Symmetry: C3
Subunit: 329 residues, 3 copies
């Protein structure tokens, strides 16, 4: 291949570049010098390592296509990405739509996705809510409970003094993260895998007896540490997949389309509702478990297919059918 | 093959029909029209999809053998299954023995399986118990504690007024679900895999600080959402396997035998006791993780073997050795 | 091969002996007669089974090399192992350094590994601590809190009466167990896999509502039941791997080297710190999940590589390059 596959040296670069190698591409990682050994020695998946944040000129010279990851908004910034001259796998317009809370809400509403109800006025609370002044977060049962806690925790003594808070329907369920891939080449959605994200200290507090917890003011945090593989109850799959289809269709109207990997981040309630908190409109690191395929890909492929490999398969096929320009922005 | 493998379109049908395809069988799914795309498009494992609850005549015409799942008792009912004219993989007599609490208890007792002690009289309580009036469930330390709580939660003011409750030894341990397969063709038990079931809201409450929990009357639910793969400590395997052997042997006496997949559903205590709450005498959906084999099957096979594939292997071999009638009822 | 691979019949023997078979070795398990069927029938990985605790003479006659596991210190004892005449895969000097709390502390300090701060004097407490009189364990905020609890729980009324306790910095994080392998043949460290150990009753208490917990004096236990596969956030890998490198380098100075499998047992904090509680300087049973390779080995191998197989690969290669004596003590 003339085209090389490149990505930032973090997040899911190991999986992405291995998938690229499996499909016959030469690979490029770019990032911190500290992590060069990870990608060239411990897991030798990068044919080139460039010790720079975003080496645009070198990437152009190497005929690179960049695969975006969660490290893109986090480490390079939306404006840098939107202005990049290196071909980008996916639609870079999606970045604003997934990052802006209001645009994301508009997207999910158009896609008919179940999300927590937002309350603009605390006096409209009729079911338990989570108040977001993940730090300082607390629950409120009703308006009366809210105002007592607004006084106790936030020092609010008058209703006109309440400012810059989020009030949201509290939705209790188990975290579930389905990983999708939409092929623009084949015009087809796939379920790639599913994971349960592993977070600290939130996933550690369950090991602490209530009695010991109550002696302290608990400071619950949601730092992402890793990922645990799961499968869903089979009868839940159709609605999870239909949700993915609706998200893609909505994006076709709103932002010029969505293709490649994405994830809907949410919880499953005891009433079997998938309620979505966030959309990640690119590869998520939960896919890293599935370098050797997943319980889902092995239902439909004769070989191991990670999301990383699936990306490289899409690029290769696009090249094979003279439509590479269709999958790049 | 003349014989085709069929199952209801839910529970573990993806795994079952993929396993059938891997072994050279043509496949049939039957169920709700809503889920047809799951089995024909997103994961194309069904050669035929019949949009009916139980299309007996069509299944007979297609020379189907039906593989039972948890969706059978749940969605078709024991009487329908017992009367079905389509050949059934396994012993359909087991359905009553696994579903009737007293027959199940008799089975497990005969099989020398550790189960929670049942208390008929609350005044006989000498160790902590769980009271089942999973809703309304509460613990009691002793008879005095029980009667106070029976008054508080159930309104029982006189001992003669207590009616229709379950009182059971409370057993604290981590949920463990070993998946077995007994080959009637080979007269051999295998351990196929092990999972930890993922349930809502019960597996979500550990993420909630005690302080926040105590502000509400908690309503703990055990809705099944999915499955997480596990392995056991190696020194625990022999007793887990011996338990499986005893279950099979007991069934040979009581109900005309048990063969094919099954699962013992329970917990492991800190004293390394496997205590069983339920038997599922057919494929369990925890096996869905292991489409590409499991940490256990890869110890003894040179290829990926799911429980679904193992079922198809048994059927094929039965056909090969002219003993298909032995594995069907 | 003339050399046969042997191990005690527990812990990770299934994985070890399967890995040995995959690499062309004949295999020996030795242990309890009760477990013979596990290794010869249910998972036929042992060519020879010797029904003895440590059959030295028979093992010498069979040209065995022994692969150590966690069952070695637990079931045979350090003195027996140090005196064994059968060739031992790894450095048997490491056993004291990993088992003696003070030697282990010295090792980890030399290796620049983050560990909980130890407090010799309770009056020096300035951050929350765990007190270890895992039974009887409690937390203390400060010296005043400690002495109140020392009186309440331990009956200590005078400061001079306090004896034989451990006081340690309390570190809240999610359990993480990276599995390493250092090849002496190749002079190279690998990350083999990562798991989250599954423990009872500690991992069951999160399913119990705070209200129900508080009615009882909780007795939290940490009995190991099994293992759950995980991957880490990719940006955390370099420091995890560097920690492994430092451990190996430190051992080269202190104890004549470390090679073969090992594990650093700890937690990841919300501030992305890996804090280590223990080192296990041999194969850990968390590797048992990865009989068919791991999300990490499949990044760098074209075939399934468990830690068990990796051990056999090292032995075979040592033989191939006439340096077997270098990997044995
Ligand atoms: N509406 C909600 N209901 C229940 N849990 C929530 C809600 N919003 C956020 N959370 C939880 O709190 C964490 C931090 O929230 P955020 O800061 O909004 O990402 C999330 O990862 C969720 O687990
Ligand atoms: N005897 C028992 N001891 C401890 N936990 C139990 C017991 N019986 C049931 N449970 C738990 O409560 C849940 C619901 O119980 P059941 O409604 O009997 O299936 C089960 O899935 C178990 O996790
Ligand atoms: N310094 C510490 N901070 C937090 N948790 C700890 C600490 N030391 C031990 N633990 C936990 O308590 C369990 C039993 O401790 P030990 O008896 O020291 O192995 C460990 O497996 C850890 O999960
Ligand atoms: N563990 C699972 O994923 C699971 N999936 C289904 N089941 C059982 O089978 C019954 C039918 O499932 P479904 O309602 O998804 O068709 C359910 O009520 C449940 O008891 C399970 N235990
Ligand atoms: N993680 C595991 O599955 C595990 N299995 C065994 N072990 C360790 O090895 C020792 C011996 O195990 P066994 O008692 O199953 O032979 C145990 O006391 C324990 O410290 C483990 N950590
Ligand atoms: N689930 C994961 O392992 C994960 N890894 C990374 N991320 C997201 O990507 C962002 C960048 O990750 P990193 O800081 O490791 O480069 C993080 O802030 C986080 O939002 C994840 N969700
Ligand atoms: Cl992510
Ligand atoms: Cl089931
Ligand atoms: Cl171990
Ligand atoms: Na988003
Ligand atoms: Na049952
Ligand atoms: Na140690």
């Amino acid at each position: 291949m003339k085209v090389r596959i490149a990505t930032y040296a973090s997040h899911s670069a190991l999986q992405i570049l291995k998938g690229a190698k499996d499909e016959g591409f030469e690979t490029i990682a770019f990032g911190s010098s500290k992590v060069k050994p990870l990608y060239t020695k411990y897991f030798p998946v990068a044919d080139y390592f460039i010790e720079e944040k975003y080496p645009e000129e070198e990437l152009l010279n190497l005929n690179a296509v960049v695969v975006p990851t969660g490290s893109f908004v986090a480490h390079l910034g939306i404006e840098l990405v939107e202005n990049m001259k290196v071909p980008y796998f996916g639609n870079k317009r999606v970045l604003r739509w997934e990052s802006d809370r209001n645009l994301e809400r508009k997207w999910l509403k158009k896609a008919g996705i179940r999300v927590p109800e937002v309350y603009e006025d605390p006096d409209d609370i009729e079911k338990p809510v989570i108040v977001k002044p993940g730090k300082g977060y607390f629950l409120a049962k009703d308006p009366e409970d809210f105002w007592r806690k607004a006084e106790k925790f936030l020092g609010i003594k008058r209703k006109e003094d309440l400012k810059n808070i989020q009030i949201q329907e509290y939705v209790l369920g188990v975290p579930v993260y389905p990983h999708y891939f939409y092929s623009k080449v084949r015009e087809e959605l796939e379920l790639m895998s599913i994971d349960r994200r592993y977070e600290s200290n939130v996933d550690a507090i369950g090991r602490i007896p209530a009695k010991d917890q109550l002696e302290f003011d608990m400071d619950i945090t949601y730092t992402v540490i890793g990922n645990i593989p799961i499968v869903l109850r089979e009868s839940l799959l159709m609605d999870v997949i239909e949700a993915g289809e609706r998200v893609v269709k909505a994006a076709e109207e709103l932002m010029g389309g969505l293709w490649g990997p994405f994830c809907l981040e949410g919880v499953f309630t005891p009433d079997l509702e998938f309620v979505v908190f966030e959309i990640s409109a690119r590869i998520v690191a939960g896919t890293n478990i599935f370098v050797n395929g997943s319980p889902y890909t092995w239902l439909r492929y004769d070989r191991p297919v990670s999301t990383g490999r699936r990306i490289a398969m899409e690029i290769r096929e696009a090249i094979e059918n003279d439509m590479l320009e269709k999958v790049l922005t």
